[PDB]
Design a protein around this ligand. Structure first.
Ligand SMILES: [Cl-]
Ligand SMILES: [Mg+2]
Ligand SMILES: [Mg+2]
Ligand SMILES: [Zn+2]
Ligand SMILES: [Zn+2]
Lengths: 163, 163
């Protein structure tokens, strides 16, 4: 028995009380960019219901090109117009540097990844940096609201960052 | 006000009942790669609790280099050893093609994106292609289980896909 097996069993119960289908476009025309961190239940954190919001998550809530791609699709094809960025306290990206992470992988595998690990030293600062990445990008321009926050993993509160 | 405003007010209530902080490493040592699709509440779909699992989401649940990066970090730094891949029915990626998407963006903005939109015609087949991407990648090699599923947006049920 794996965790996957357990989660599939959970899904049978989820399915038993499921109502659907809902429409594809987010009913609230909003996209959340968040971290993959195990301590972030994005839906409960923001009181989101099914069908309302796109949720995009990766290591460190980094505005990579994959995030730009997902946001471009979200706005242009599926009509979203708000963006929430969520970093958080005690994030894994503050605990290593890119050069160290790459060197370690190179030692084990013989090669260095071409991608940047995208670590950063300070979360508040990187929210500003991430907001700027979105502002400067010519493909994510349909939003009427772009706001960035740091989630406190000890209190559950969101604290806004000024760009 | 905006939806962001409403969602922030929702967080006040969330924060009132919060219990933390929890440890950084996923307590169930698992990573989920899923779609940003608004109809997918991944936590509830799999009966996930706070602190258990990394959840990564983009447009179309595509295994891009950002997903590879996030899995590499998840495994190497934070000890996850299982992967669940999660496509779904009525996916937005089935509704367009890459070339036409980029053509539209270029007509409107004067610029063509560097990134591939990464659309695909067949969700089940792309699960297989996604599993294959992970299996051949030299930077994500630690998992003891890698499984892919198609979430039915009409029933809430997961259907496993086999290579
Ligand atoms: Cl989520
Ligand atoms: Mg912009
Ligand atoms: Mg591999
Ligand atoms: Zn994090
Ligand atoms: Zn989708």
């Amino acid at each position: 028995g794996t965790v996957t097996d357990d989660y599939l069993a959970n899904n049978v119960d989820y399915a038993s009380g499921f109502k659907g289908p809902l429409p594809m476009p987010p009913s609230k025309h909003i996209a959340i960019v968040a971290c993959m961190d195990a301590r972030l239940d994005v839906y409960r954190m923001l009181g989101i219901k099914e069908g309302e919001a796109h949720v995009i998550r990766n290591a460190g809530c980094v505005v990579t090109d994959d995030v730009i791609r997902s946001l471009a699709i979200s706005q242009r094809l599926l009509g979203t117009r708000e963006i929430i960025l969520l970093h958080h306290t005690d994030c894994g990206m503050l605990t290593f540097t890119d050069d160290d992470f790459k060197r370690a992988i190179q030692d084990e595998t013989g090669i260095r990844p071409t991608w940047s690990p995208e670590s950063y030293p300070d979360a508040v600062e990187d929210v500003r940096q991430s907001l700027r990445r979105i502002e400067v990008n010519p493909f994510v321009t349909k939003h009427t609201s772009l706001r960035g926050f740091v989630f406190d993993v000890a209190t559950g509160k969101l604290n806004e960052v000024t760009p």
